[PDB]
Design a protein around this ligand. Structure first.
Ligand SMILES: Cc1cc([C@@H](C)Nc2ccccc2C(=O)O)c2nc(N3CCOCC3)cc(=O)n2c1
Ligand SMILES: Cc1cc([C@@H](C)Nc2ccccc2C(=O)O)c2nc(N3CCOCC3)cc(=O)n2c1
Ligand SMILES: [Ca+2]
Ligand SMILES: [Ca+2]
Ligand SMILES: [Cl-]
Ligand SMILES: [Cl-]
Ligand SMILES: [Cl-]
Ligand SMILES: [Cl-]
Lengths: 306, 306
């Protein structure tokens, strides 16, 4: 029993982390097969990050300008290319620690683990969610760019995030592994800010199911509601609208606990309208929205990985 | 920037996890050099866990009764011994993935990462603290026994916890890697319950320092206090007494931020007496006490590991 914000085991990703240096700048790269992936702004000086012309800055770079180090061993770069906002470096050796992997562009509300790295060395692992406004609330310092986010399905690592930028807000923005930013952000230090940070309703509901499975049930009530009635409340509190697709995804948790989804919605409605009155749920005094329904089923059943 | 509940990279430990089966029972073991460590109650049936005589139950076991599997490969057991509440199995092959490691018995209030495992397969990683009452608030299901907790210092893994028992309360108890339980708990399913769960004051203070370093400073006030005055408040709210040793450990964070430790104590005092008034600190509506001062300095500076 017990519920915790749980990250995937990071060993498979640790074996893919390398250090990439372009003249003055050092950040992290991801080494899979014979390609190293890193943020293209590695080719930039801090003087360039205001209005960089990435295509022009890359004309002055050759393969031998990209210094790639896997732990202690230097990799030989035999080609380079820009794909959207990521630089791909072809090396002459396939990473022997390459796991089975895929590249995935995740949807807002989905969760993933982040391996925070500096100078190609792993530092820590924690769980994140892609916010509805396409930011993540992470822990990233200077040098952490190129750290990746991922999910693990038994033996396969699905890479979904590469870290690029910290916004003035203190939240974080980045790309998928094809180099396309999540949301409207660009790899330029300009005036960009995050939109409304809406709460992921279906995740809060999943987490309430997780709470009931663990004995935290003081929030269950005698009420029910409808999708349209609940959504009037969700809107007022800057919650995402709940759809029938969300209800269906909660099906297994509804079946396991015998709590109708709309009954749980009426519990959430009361929590939003009245607060918690100084109580707690699964050790939290706030409503948690970075557990997906799959996350709750995963943890509450004990699924393992290669 | 940003602060997150961050676990150590788990790869070095993943390579040490194995499955141990004794007749009917399967749990996890830790394979370091040519020894496998696991909870001794692997030799028990569910009928034995009420009043087990571990010495008598072990008389009927031989080396070939202990089935040890590292992923897919079976290990040959050439000796077995009981040390306190842990069973040590000598195998004929040294784990080639053995990291540099040590065994450490941690103090209450110290934190560590847990690699939750089932059938010798890693499932997830999360950060824990040894509570003042010698329990941990973890995420453990049946089959998770033998999962370990650890800290990583650059290249060295310091193992500090092995999971054994879930108390009726829903909290968790276990041993160091010499098999000595933390606290008064025993590996018997009897009437045992946790004592008063006191809050780790020095950790809350460290986390308030972490908050200021990130722009959450609404809780700073115009007040100060004394150790004895603050401790009158700590006692009332079931906080651990703060000592000069605690003040000294907070020195580096006090120096970095220019906030006198006793000034921060007056901020915590006001928070305890008035609550948060519906505000939040580093994304929490509660006062967090599972970050040590070292944890805050670690994350806020970017220390990495082998
Ligand atoms: C041996 C090889 C291969 C490539 C290209 C064709 N292929 C890759 C380049 C980078 C990473 C992966 C690959 C790949 O083929 O999988 C490549 N692309 C280069 N570019 C610079 C000018 O603009 C176009 C890209 C330069 C170079 O020396 N290359 C060498
Ligand atoms: C080859 C070897 C070695 C040992 C002991 C001496 N050594 C270990 C036993 C278990 C794990 C590690 C070691 C070690 O020597 O490091 C050992 N201890 C056994 N015991 C059963 C009866 O009560 C005493 C223990 C049985 C056995 O076949 N052993 C075989
Ligand atoms: Ca295979
Ligand atoms: Ca060495
Ligand atoms: Cl892994
Ligand atoms: Cl490698
Ligand atoms: Cl590791
Ligand atoms: Cl191994």
């Amino acid at each position: 029993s017990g519920f915790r914000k749980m990250a995937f085991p990071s060993g498979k990703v640790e074996g893919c982390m390398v250090q990439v240096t372009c003249g003055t700048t050092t950040l992290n790269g991801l080494w899979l097969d014979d390609v190293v992936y890193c943020p293209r702004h590695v080719i930039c000086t801090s003087e360039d990050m205001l209005n960089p012309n990435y295509e022009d800055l890359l004309i002055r770079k050759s393969n031998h300008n990209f210094l790639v180090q896997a732990g202690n061993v230097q990799l030989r770069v035999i080609g380079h290319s820009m794909q959207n906002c990521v630089l791909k470096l072809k090396v002459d050796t396939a990473n022997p620690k390459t796991p089975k992997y895929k590249f995935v562009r995740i949807q807002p509300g989905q969760t993933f683990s982040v391996l925070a790295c500096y100078n190609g060395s792993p530092s820590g692992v924690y769980q994140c969610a892609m916010r509805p406004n396409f930011t993540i609330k992470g822990s990233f310092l200077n040098g952490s760019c190129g750290s990746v986010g991922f999910n693990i399905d038994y033996d396969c690592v699905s890479f979904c995030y590469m870290h690029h930028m910290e916004l003035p807000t203190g939240v974080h923005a980045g790309t998928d592994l094809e180099g396309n930013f999540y949301g409207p952000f660009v790899d330029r230090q300009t005036a960009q800010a995050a939109g409304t940070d809406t709460t992921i309703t279906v995740n809060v509901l999943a987490w309430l199911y997780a709470a009931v499975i663990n004995g935290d049930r003081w929030f269950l009530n005698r009420f029910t509601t409808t999708l349209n009635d609940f959504n009037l409340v969700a809107m007022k509190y800057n919650y995402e609208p709940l759809t029938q697709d969300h209800v269906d995804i909660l099906g297994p948790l509804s079946a396991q606990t015998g709590i109708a989804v709309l009954d749980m919605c009426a519990s959430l409605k009361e929590l939003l309208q009245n607060g918690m009155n100084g109580r707690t749920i699964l050790g939290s005094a706030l409503l948690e929205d970075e557990f997906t329904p799959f996350d709750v089923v995963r943890q509450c059943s004990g699924v393992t990985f290669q």
